[PDB]
Scaffold this active site. Structure first.
Site, mmCIF file in Angstrom:
data_model
loop_
_atom_site.group_PDB
_atom_site.id
_atom_site.type_symbol
_atom_site.label_atom_id
_atom_site.label_comp_id
_atom_site.label_asym_id
_atom_site.label_seq_id
_atom_site.Cartn_x
_atom_site.Cartn_y
_atom_site.Cartn_z
ATOM 1 N N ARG A 98 46.887 50.175 44.336
ATOM 2 C CA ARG A 98 47.601 49.717 45.540
ATOM 3 C C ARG A 98 49.015 49.182 45.334
ATOM 4 O O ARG A 98 49.816 49.125 46.277
ATOM 5 C CB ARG A 98 46.725 48.671 46.248
ATOM 6 C CG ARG A 98 46.866 48.588 47.787
ATOM 7 C CD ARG A 98 46.388 49.865 48.475
ATOM 8 N NE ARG A 98 45.075 50.207 47.962
ATOM 9 C CZ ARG A 98 44.457 51.382 48.113
ATOM 10 N NH1 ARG A 98 45.023 52.390 48.780
ATOM 11 N NH2 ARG A 98 43.257 51.561 47.578
ATOM 12 N N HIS A 129 48.169 55.349 37.495
ATOM 13 C CA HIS A 129 48.610 54.115 38.156
ATOM 14 C C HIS A 129 48.907 52.954 37.193
ATOM 15 O O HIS A 129 48.655 51.784 37.536
ATOM 16 C CB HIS A 129 47.540 53.615 39.142
ATOM 17 C CG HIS A 129 46.999 54.679 40.030
ATOM 18 N ND1 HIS A 129 47.802 55.419 40.876
ATOM 19 C CD2 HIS A 129 45.747 55.186 40.152
ATOM 20 C CE1 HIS A 129 47.069 56.342 41.474
ATOM 21 N NE2 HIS A 129 45.819 56.223 41.050
ATOM 22 N N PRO A 137 40.362 41.568 42.332
ATOM 23 C CA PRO A 137 39.238 40.701 41.855
ATOM 24 C C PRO A 137 39.264 39.274 42.424
ATOM 25 O O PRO A 137 40.335 38.698 42.652
ATOM 26 C CB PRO A 137 39.314 40.669 40.332
ATOM 27 C CG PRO A 137 40.676 41.310 40.025
ATOM 28 C CD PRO A 137 40.960 42.278 41.181
ATOM 29 N N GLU A 138 38.079 38.690 42.620
ATOM 30 C CA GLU A 138 37.958 37.336 43.149
ATOM 31 C C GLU A 138 37.915 36.321 41.990
ATOM 32 O O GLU A 138 37.840 36.710 40.833
ATOM 33 C CB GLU A 138 36.730 37.277 44.088
ATOM 34 C CG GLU A 138 37.018 37.986 45.439
ATOM 35 C CD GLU A 138 38.167 37.317 46.252
ATOM 36 O OE1 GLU A 138 38.686 37.936 47.213
ATOM 37 O OE2 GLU A 138 38.570 36.169 45.950
#
Ligand SMILES: [Zn+2]
Length: 252
Positions: free
Chosen positions: A111, A92, A1-2
DNA sequence: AGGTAGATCCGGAC
DNA sequence: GTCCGGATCTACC
């Protein structure tokens, strides 16, 4: 997220965890834990502390507990959720903080790129990853003057400068490309070649761009599509080692 | 002395 | 296989 999304997470997560006390911390991928280096010490120290607040610096979330601060970076795909300890874990999930009320704060990241550092509160701002963080882009401390000072002193590209966390906190790739397009500045331009008129314009577009977002896209990911302002096809190249989009006609 | 490039992590996508 | 990425951390002047 930004940065905008992180600010939304900060605002929405706080009420779901404020006042809860940690009864256990379970780690399924030790590498996420960067300090203390030993994930067992990380887990042990958190036990018994109550969550008192949640702040944000750049794209880092700072959880304030009783004695410690937990500094977390979600990178590209990390995500937090609050749910019941009675339900099966989503895929995850690498770190789970179990609260005494039977709820849990779960950290998921396909990731596995995110990081967690825990330090006594009075020390977090003087240690990694927060130590050399630059000013918030929407704060008066990030000024045209400050940008000018940094630009003049480096031989790097304007894009490389804006991506530098010591220059401005958490301004991502997408916002850098959109801000340069709105300011009419090519990303591969040497930072030191910008005039003060350009520096001021760049500063204003950075603030409006990220400000609008925190509160579509012109070039980011629109490679090969016509520019929304002039119709020229948007181009994509590698600048500062990252995917970079720009309009060849409108940016100089 | 200290900027700055290169390496690094990780697992979907193409 | 290859590419890609935030913010280190390491190494080259
Ligand atoms: Zn255009």
């Amino acid at each position: 997220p930004e940065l905008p999304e992180v600010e939304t997470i900060r605002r929405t997560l706080l009420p779901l965890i404020v006042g809860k006390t940690i009864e256990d911390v379970r780690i399924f991928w030790p590498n996420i834990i960067r300090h203390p280096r030993d994930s067992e010490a990380f887990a042990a120290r958190m036990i018994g502390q109550t969550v008192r607040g949640l702040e944000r610096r750049g794209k880092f979330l700072k959880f304030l507990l009783d004695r410690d601060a937990l500094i977390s970076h979600l990178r590209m795909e990390g995500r937090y959720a609050v749910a019941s300890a009675l339900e099966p874990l989503e895929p995850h999930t690498h770190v789970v903080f179990c609260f005494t009320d039977g709820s849990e704060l779960r950290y998921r990241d396909v990731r596995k790129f995110g990081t967690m550092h825990v330090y006594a509160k009075e020390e977090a701002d003087r240690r990694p990853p927060l130590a050399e963080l630059g000013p918030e882009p929407l704060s008066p401390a990030f000024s045209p003057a400050v940008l000018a000072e940094r630009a003049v002193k480096t031989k790097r590209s304007v894009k490389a400068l804006l991506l530098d966390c010591t220059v401005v906190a958490g301004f991502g790739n997408i916002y850098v490309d959109e801000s340069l397009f709105r300011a009419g500045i090519l990303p591969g331009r040497p930072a030191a070649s910008l005039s003060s008129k350009e520096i001021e314009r760049l500063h204003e577009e950075m603030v409006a761009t990220i400000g609008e977002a925190v509160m579509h896209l012109y070039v980011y990911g629109r490679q090969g599509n016509p520019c929304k302002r002039c119709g020229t096809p948007i181009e994509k190249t590698v600048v500062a080692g990252r995917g970079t989009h720009y309009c060849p006609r409108c940016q100089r």
